[PDB]
Amino acid sequence: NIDGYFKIYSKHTPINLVRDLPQGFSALEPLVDLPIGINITRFQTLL
């Protein structure tokens, strides 16, 4: 969240592992820029 702009970068890839995130390297291209101008100090996921 920079100057009220919310930047969301994303990336996906198939994996086969059940312990933790696999070791490797990849790049997360930008996907969304949102003009919220909204204060941010907390977040929470939803599953």
Binding site: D3, G4, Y5, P35, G37, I38, N39
Partner: protein, 49 residues
Amino acid sequence: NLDSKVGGNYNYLYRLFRKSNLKPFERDISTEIYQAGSTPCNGVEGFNC
């Protein structure tokens, strides 16, 4: 010619108190009561509230 009224147009507002200055392009529409003194306001307006 558009926004003024003979009796006074009060529909336009401005924020008078805030704990800190705004960052660029920030938008604050909160209506939290500002405690200007040492007495807690508890959401009640008044002296220093």
